[model samples]
Target: KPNYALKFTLAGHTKAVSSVKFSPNGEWLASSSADKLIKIWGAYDGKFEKTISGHKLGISDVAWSSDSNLLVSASDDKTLKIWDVSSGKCLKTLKGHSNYVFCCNFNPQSNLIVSGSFDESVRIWDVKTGKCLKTLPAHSDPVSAVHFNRDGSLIVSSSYDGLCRIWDTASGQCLKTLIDNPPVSFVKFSPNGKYILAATLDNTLKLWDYSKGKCLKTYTGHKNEKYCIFANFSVTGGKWIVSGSEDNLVYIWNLQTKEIVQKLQGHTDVVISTACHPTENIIASAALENDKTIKLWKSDC
Candidate 1:
């Protein structure tokens, strides 16, 4: 049994907090919101440091590059913007998606970015030149999540179409597809690089051995019948899976046992997104429009 008690509740977003991500170096936690603002906070102390606002519409997701010096944001304005984290300035704006950009992530080398959009396409861009490298007509429905594998060799994108497609990064080819009975809202590769974890609208999270197209385990008990809730593998070692719930709580499950080991209860509205600290026991969860707050939880040792 593990204990993760709430450390502090961060309040400032004027609207729904859509996503939260820890910097790869573990110094900061960045959050994007429907308020059209992105805020950077101290990872351990939960103190707000600065705010970024340039998107014409709401921001749906934010991701930090491996160097921790830059961040890429996806927005309802149908563009992705790269930011210099230290200066709090927009470095470049990537425009290619014709609809809302729902998710974006940087590859391990920080030289490339992968994005998913309401346009139902997955686009990869060169970070240095901000040029679109490839456009993958990824799904029949809106793409909800996109991520790069550990080696930057593969990518995974999930959509409202109920499919998670793995792509060959260099060739922009679909390598494999993992199907779900319900729309998949979030997907991430395992730290070991052999598996992927997907959160679906059916209120279940399935761990799949993507290479073999087999499910290794399924975790249940969190409410997620609607909304694009996000989930992740505990970056400390990937022994746990953490997710936000439509029931207004954060659920943490044991990766091997498939048991609900802890439920962080505090959000007053649907917890739409979550992030785990890269090298620590802290976890960050953000709420939807009704709450407009982000809660930080840490091991209660």
Candidate 2:
């Protein structure tokens, strides 16, 4: 773990970057920020490729289609825009939210997209028709995070109301509410679909047995008071838990031993998002201040 090294830094966005994501094929990388820009780069080479600009306000989140030909972004502009990755052209504008949209994701099949908003709703849209399909009044407060599970059967969201709700995507049935959820803004299911990993405002990282409605583990030693801070399971078999910290550092924890394994230091500001590559074992993180850059890390090869 100590051997992991920062491979390169992506510098383009003038403002703090809100999110960084690898394409579905892990061939390209995209980053969105308060500068109202989405920059694409070669994931394998870390070379600047293209810049996408359209949003009137800061982009909050981004997602890549299953085929890696398209991208979607949610913004404070109160709209979700779909784009053609190759040309960097805005292909569709999905507008309905009366407030800022915080999070969004493409379903596993790439036929549908879902977004959570401060309007207190989770709206699902048909990708081809660009039409709203369903609206689930997800939470009393702003819905901070939303995602389609690996199989697209389950839709999960985390909200500011201190709850994580799970729904059946096809039937729209409210399956369960995780009452023990903290006020953190992000929650994601692990790769194997066995547990939900959340970095909560309570200043701890937790693994939950969502199927049985129980907490599996709580990992400490990292400050996560920032609501935007999110964690990821290193996609290489979920062996490590990686998260950005309010303390201006990125932390990697061994999932099995539950111990702090590495503290990646470079950013001079709060690290808001962390993501591991789907199969490459590389990890990436973005910060909103100081450097305003995306840093990529790799284990010694």
Candidate 3:
């Protein structure tokens, strides 16, 4: 049987769309584009709600606060901007990175903002005052992505230098480093915060046990480079993992069985971003193509 899919043509952006993400509450969907604009839309019916235009360059990534009232966006302008979602106004502009900021994540519990940049540093900032709390200089190359654990006690950052570093959020100390021979595109902690999953340019996904600081498993099924990976335990008592690849494919894997459960194929170009709905079995993906659209898929498996 053919699967049903819905296409959301967020037509506000004049250039390539880089990233798309749904709010924690699943009420809003936000997208950033190379045109230097971030737009928010109603997730239920894809109605345009607001547009944020301040970044001087392309927006690379955006993170939503736990309360879903605030949003943070990083851009090639070498700055991060925090906005009040209610008024659609820029609340604060954070400046520190000497180069483009690639990724940012919010620590829901601590209200700490962590950002990775081409400046080769990971910075922690206070969300309230826009103050730099700490700076960790370890990655020799561009830091591509950073994420905080579910508890907001630890942070994991992946770099183009082929290293993933785990840091204690409070002490600012490096806890572990998982090194690969090729550049790592993304790193994310599992829902339990007991494991870390990383996607590498070598077309492999590596899982590390945070408690033991050891690589527990490596899943290799993609023939091309993987650009993003996300892992979370589902409400149905199953562990679900998804990856977006430069080969224009998205694979959903069952972590317990270490096997590919579903392979979704549709994108005509590289899939730059992918995210699973927080509660449902659906997924949202964006690609670099003419349409530059976002697609929502309902999984049957």
Candidate 4:
């Protein structure tokens, strides 16, 4: 068993932190918050690096480019902004969503981006040009999460409509639909790119074989019936699944066994976001308004 211990407790965001992500290069950590700011930190030591500010409203989510030098952020202001990490400058402001932009992600190559919005649509954008390449009328309800598969040829979107859709990036067509979910709050592709993991408001995390449109496993034991709590795969080896819970705990489950392995406790309120380091045994977790703090955990081994 890997014994996890708290390394750093950060309270940089004034409001609830919405998202936390480690750069693909595994050197930096970027976190977005309802305070309308994104804070950058050194991954190893938790040192403050930079602060990006400009969003007109609260930021919803942030994604890092494969090169790790660029970041794309979604906001309740109905726009997305691309930022240069080194300069902490906004490079481009992408607009056109009629409602709040909920989720965003950069393709593996970093040449393209995909975003989902409360406007009930998904959009593909060209990174260099800041142009919307295509808009897919993706879901009947507000989109909650969007992600690109490993190869970047396919995109997956989850919605409050209780369904998950797979789209072909080039054609802007819906390739397949995974149905019968209970209002999915987050969705992501597996590390191997062979499966999809979804967090539903029904208080469960489900792994699906998207190609087969079949549910493979269900992971439970965490409270998630309210907010859009986010969950992620273990970065160390993909053997575990990690998630934030309304019960103020960060949960880690053995992927194959579907058993709760670890529950890191520290937050005083709902823990909404948890992110695993790209190349290490560290996990970052952020809480809701009552806590409004971020905590980093490391494996003692």
lDDT (10s digit) by residue, model 3, range 66-148: 88888999999999999898898898899999999999989967388999999999999999999889999959999988999
The local lDDT score (0 to 100) that residue 10 gets in candidate 1 is 94
lDDT of 4 by residue, 1-301 (tens): 5567899988889999999999999998899999999999888888988899999999989999999999999999999999999999999999889999999999999999899999999999999989999999999999999999999999999999999999998999999998855898999999999899999998999999999878899999999998887789885854789999999999999899899989999998899899999878999999988998889899843
TM-score of each: 0.98, 0.96, 0.91, 0.98
Superposition error at 49 for model 3 (Å): 2.2
CA deviation > 4 Å runs, candidate 3: 1-11, 223-238
Clashing pairs in model 1, backbone N/Cα/C closer than 3 A: none
Model 3: how far is 77 from its true place, Å?
0.4
Give the per-residue lDDT digits (tens) of candidate 2, residues 204-270: 8889999898888877898877556768877564478888888888988888788998899988788
Question: RMSD for each model, in Å, please?
Answer: 1.2, 1.4, 2.4, 1.0
Candidate 1, residues 1-116, lDDT tens digits: the string is 56888889899999999999999889999999999999999999899999998999999999999999999999999999999999999999999999999999999999999999
Ranking by TM-score: 4, 1, 2, 3
Q: What is the C-alpha lDDT of each candidate?
A: 0.92, 0.86, 0.79, 0.92
Candidate 4 Cα deviation (angstroms), residue 232: 1.0
Pick the winner on TM-score between candidates 3 and 4. 4
Model 4 TM-score relative to the real fold:
0.98
